[PDB]
Design a binder for this molecule. Structure first.
Ligand SMILES: *[C@@H]1O[C@H](CO)[C@@H](O[C@@H]2O[C@H](CO)[C@@H](O[C@@H]3O[C@H](CO[C@H]4O[C@H](CO)[C@@H](O)[C@H](O[C@H]5O[C@H](CO)[C@@H](O)[C@H](O)[C@@H]5O[C@H]5O[C@H](CO)[C@@H](O)[C@H](O)[C@@H]5O)[C@@H]4O)[C@@H](O)[C@H](O[C@H]4O[C@H](CO)[C@@H](O)[C@H](O)[C@@H]4O[C@H]4O[C@H](CO)[C@@H](O)[C@H](O)[C@@H]4O)[C@@H]3O)[C@H](O)[C@H]2NC(C)=O)[C@H](O)[C@H]1NC(C)=O
Ligand SMILES: Cc1cc(OCc2n[nH]c(=O)n2C)c(-c2cc(C(N)=O)ccc2OC(F)(F)F)cc1Cl
Ligand SMILES: [Ca+2]
Ligand SMILES: [Cl-]
Ligand SMILES: [K+]
Ligand code: NA
Ligand SMILES: [Zn+2]
Length: 805
């Protein structure tokens, strides 16, 4: 109940919420059905529109007008935004030459440059180029400030998950807004875009920017605008707040536009109907900048022009129906559209089985336009699993398509020509970022980056300490003229042991055999030098990785590779090697096919054994440093050390062998040498974070050899490919992957074919940032380079996406 009989007189868009059932005048009041009786009359005036005209100049103040052109309006802070242009002979901001803002030029009483976040829904990255002729205000912000060619949203590429990621710096799995629609089984409650229930505090995790600000003594404007407050009124409200007395005035503000998304759904991303919404958004930016110019704030405020996601061509005819796959279609609940989430219709139905649902959805039709996954098997780069609101069964839907339960769902719900929500690496889902103001750089282009990084920067812009989040703070320092955040490298927690030869061959009873008893002082000194690290500079190019947790591990040196060998997990945490452009690929000699050799530096007790693999009828093994790339017949024996062996399903060995035999040399040819670091990952609870040993769910049968859930590789070379990887003077170039360690290749519909037709495609799908691997392993890479730490942080957040231009 609201007692709507109070009044909004002098309270319009008040900043604190009043306690029920006293009537409200804040911007959420409409959403709650709780505004005072006179809120429309007082707070949503429209009389005479939004622009001054020559005849209104110097008018007698009429309180009924939407905005004012009377002489007193500047000090009231409520002129129409074009007031100074129409009445005082001033230019529009867009018509002024771009002039570098080296320092904040702020009115007296401003303690910091305010931040205004101008957020646009459905604003696809390519609109910046393709709509440039009709967006002069946005184009000026872009060319004069700092801009990226695009900004990567989070998955799913929907509005609420992305805007709340902007607010918090968190993946949706951590902040809890995992879709525009959700069921939480603990709450037994459902989240819907319609109504006030979505406002319930239990949906919203993390700490959004307006709460971070408030907790630290920085005042915030309210970020949510009810759909029926027109854009011109949103801008006027922000401008009015900016005229409050110092002690009352916020320092951070947000504007939101539901365009171009709304029209993009109806017309498609490039429908001829899209020109007008683009022009209208630009006019709104123009109103804001003119308004700031009037308030002498246009060289004081930092403006962020940012989108939530793009927009793809999607029509009713491109819908896959689960009723064409599943016999049991009525025992499932589907969250449909550009992604699929499936769960049981009734928890009382004990005949429901995810395994048979997945199999019925796997590679069933030749050009099938979705792929089913258990959520833990989704590409780790999506970070889309660790939340009870994310259903165990997920459908990744191809761009341009939908999935629905039954045909009747599509015509009893063609309307739409555009949609979004797909994989966040898809070109059409990319969105925009521009920063303009004293704290941003002047006329500067920066590489694409992920929207999870922005919260930290917004906190920097406001002098706030960010709450713990998924950005990598310092990775966007290159966007900023000042206020950069200068992190220190994390401290190494565990120091390695450097074992020498400590065991005789006969102390090992591992059930391994090798045909290696084939027998020189010249070359004997060499083998010793190699085991002491003489080639380490070639193979460990950026320092050894730091181990950031407590554990027991050994550094092992070899001619062709170096490794950090875990005595706890019985295998390397990492294996580092360099392959030059000139390197030759060789085969595994016939006599060495099943060769595994005890490592006399490492105790039998801390070694794997061959017998476990023989007895485990499902599990085989592979090698982290590939025998195919040995530098010489003699160095090849090192590759068969038991300390280089890792457990691998035969199905996965197909993938791994093709990567190691073919693709590594391909990359070294293409990139002018590569340095490779490879290793295992254990993430049995799918939280994106390294497992402790007590979290491991599967071992090689009859042993304490843990089975990895994933294998990673980090492949580094010189950004200037005229220099070889091992003699690189400047910036680095990286690509990485985190491949799922699966007992079948059901994910790859073409897997019965030669590896050349499917393996690299699988690897591309599982592309990763170095930072993702850091989370998953508790390792810290690139500790010793000649590069600045912030540059390395940027490198660690890089994702090679494989999309075209
Ligand atoms: C991305 O960045 C984020 C933020 O840094 C990273 O997430 C952090 O990861 C930490 C490790 O997973 C985690 O730390 C835990 O916090 C527990 C306290 O949790 C509450 O308090 C915080 C702080 O205010 C709050 O933010 C939390 O918010 C979560 O939960 C609410 C609802 O419950 C949601 O609204 C919200 O969205 C968020 O949910 C997300 O995280 C939780 C996990 O907390 C998931 O379950 C959800 O799916 C969702 O993703 C909480 O309100 C603390 O109690 C934990 O301590 C346990 O474990 C330690 C191990 O050191 C052990 O010593 C303790 O004894 C304790 O174990 C006991 O309980 C166990 C479980 O019941 C039991 O098994 C044991 O036997 C013990 O009895 C733990 O320290 C931190 O909460 C989150 N923070 C956030 C905001 O998500 C994230 O990892 C980054 N991602 C990547 C890939 O890097
Ligand atoms: C730029 C930006 C815009 C935001 O809403 C813009 C908006 N106004 N009107 C409309 O429909 N939307 C989406 C929100 C946002 C704020 C709140 C809050 N309580 O203040 C709640 C929910 C919100 O949005 C979300 F859930 F999508 F995050 C957060 C940021 Cl960072
Ligand atoms: Ca884990
Ligand atoms: Cl959704
Ligand atoms: K086996
Ligand atoms: Na297959
Ligand atoms: Zn939309």
């Amino acid at each position: 109940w609201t007692a709507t009989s109070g009044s909004c007189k002098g309270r319009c868009f008040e900043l604190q919420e009043v306690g029920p059932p006293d009537c409200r005048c804040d911007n959420l009041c409409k959403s709650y059905s709780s505004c005072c009786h006179d809120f429309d009359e007082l707070c949503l005036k429209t009389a005479r529109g939004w622009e001054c005209t020559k005849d209104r100049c110097g008018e007698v103040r009429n309180e009924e007008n939407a905005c004012h052109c009377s002489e007193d309006c500047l000090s009231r802070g409520d002129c129409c935004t074009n007031y100074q242009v129409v009445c005082k002979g001033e230019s529009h901001w867009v018509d002024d030459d771009c002039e570098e803002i080296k320092v904040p030029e702020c009115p007296a009483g401003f303690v910091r440059p305010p931040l205004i976040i101008f957020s646009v829904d459905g604003f696809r990255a390519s609109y910046m180029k393709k709509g440039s002729k009709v967006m002069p205000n946005i184009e000026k912000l872009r060319s004069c400030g700092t801009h990226a060619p695009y900004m990567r949203p989070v998955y799913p590429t929907k509005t609420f998950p992305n805007l709340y990621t902007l607010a918090t710096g968190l993946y949706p799995e951590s902040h809890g807004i995992v879709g525009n629609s959700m069921y939480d089984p603990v709450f037994d409650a459902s989240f819907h875009l319609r109504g006030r229930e979505k406002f319930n505090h239990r949906w919203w995790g993390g700490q959004p920017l307006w709460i971070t600000a408030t907790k630290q003594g920085v005042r915030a404007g309210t970020f949510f605008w009810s759909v029926s407050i027109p854009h011109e009124r949103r801008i006027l409200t922000i401008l009015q707040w900016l005229s409050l007395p110092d002690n009352e005035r916020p320092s951070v503000y947000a504007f939101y536009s539901e365009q171009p998304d709304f029209s993009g759904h109806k017309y498609g991303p490039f429908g001829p109907e899209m020109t007008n919404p683009l022009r209208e958004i630009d006019k709104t930016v123009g109103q804001l900048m003119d308004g700031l110019k009037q308030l002498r704030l246009h060289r004081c405020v930092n403006v962020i022009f940012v989108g939530d996601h793009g927009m793809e061509d999607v029509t009713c005819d491109r819908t896959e129906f689960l009723s064409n796959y599943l016999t049991n279609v009525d025992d499932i609940t589907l969250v449909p559209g550009t992604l699929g989430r499936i769960r049981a219709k009734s928890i009382n139905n004990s005949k429901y089985d995810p395994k048979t649902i997945i199999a019925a959805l796997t590679c069933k039709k030749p050009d099938q336009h979705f792929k089913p996954y258990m959520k833990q098997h989704l590409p780790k780069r999506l970070h889309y699993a660790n939340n009870r609101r994310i259903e165990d069964i997920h459908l990744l839907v191809d761009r341009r398509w939908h999935v629905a339960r039954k045909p009747l769902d599509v015509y009893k719900k063609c309307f739409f020509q555009g949609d979004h929500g797909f994989d966040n690496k898809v070109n059409s889902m990319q969105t925009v970022f521009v920063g303009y103001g004293p704290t941003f750089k002047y006329r500067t282009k920066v590489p694409p980056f992920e929207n999870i990084e922005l919260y930290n920067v917004m906190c920097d812009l406001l002098g706030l300490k960010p709450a713990p989040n998924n950005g990598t703070h310092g990775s966007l320092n290159h966007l900023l003229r000042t206020n950069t955040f200068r992190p220190t490298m994390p401290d190494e927690v565990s120091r390695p042991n450097y074992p020498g030869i400590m065991y005789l061959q006969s102390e090992f009873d591992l059930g391994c055999t090798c045909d290696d008893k084939v027998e020189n002082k010249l070359e004997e000194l060499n083998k010793r030098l190699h085991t002491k690290g003489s080639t380490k500079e070639r193979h460990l190019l950026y320092g050894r990785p730091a181990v950031l947790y407590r554990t027991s591990y050994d550094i092992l040196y070899h001619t062709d590779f170096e490794s950090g060998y875990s005595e706890i997990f019985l295998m390397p945490l990492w294996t580092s090697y360099t392959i030059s452009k000139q390197a030759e690929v060789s085969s595994i000699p016939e006599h060495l096919t099943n060769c595994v050799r005890p490592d006399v530096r490492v105790s039998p007790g801390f070694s794997q054994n061959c017998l476990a693999y023989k007895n485990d009828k499902q599990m085989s093994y592979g090698f982290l440093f590939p025998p195919y790339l040995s530098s010489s017949p003699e160095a090849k024996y090192d590759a068969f050390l038991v300390t280089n062996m890792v457990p691998m399903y035969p199905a996965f060995k197909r993938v791994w062998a093709y990567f190691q035999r073919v693709l590594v040399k391909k990359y070294a040819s293409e990139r002018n040498g590569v340095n490779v670091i490879s290793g295992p990952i254990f993430d049995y609870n799918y939280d994106g974070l390294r497992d402790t040993e007590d979290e491991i769910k599967q071992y090689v049968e009859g042993s304490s050899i843990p089975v990895p859930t994933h294998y990673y590789s980090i492949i580094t070379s010189c950004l200037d490919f005229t220099q070889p990887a091992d003699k690189c003077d400047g910036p680095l170039s990286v690509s990485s992957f985190i491949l799922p360690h699966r007992p079948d290749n059901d994910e790859s519909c073409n897997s019965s074919e030669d590896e050349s037709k499917w393996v690299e495609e699988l690897m591309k799908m599982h592309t990763a940032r170095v930072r993702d691997i850091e989370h998953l392993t508790g390792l810290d890479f690139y500790r010793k380079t000649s590069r600045s730490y912030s540059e390395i942080l940027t490198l660690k957040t890089y994702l090679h996406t494989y999309e075209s231009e």
